[PDB]
Design a protein around this ligand. Structure first.
Ligand SMILES: [Cl-]
Ligand SMILES: [Cl-]
Ligand SMILES: [Cl-]
Ligand SMILES: [Tb+3]
Length: 17
């Protein structure tokens, strides 16, 4: 995964495929 919002987690739209 890519932590695009750099919050330290993989979540939300970062998981939206
Ligand atoms: Cl990756
Ligand atoms: Cl990342
Ligand atoms: Cl889809
Ligand atoms: Tb994130």
């Amino acid at each position: 995964y890519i932590d695009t919002n750099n919050d330290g987690w993989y979540e939300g739209d970062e998981l939206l495929a």
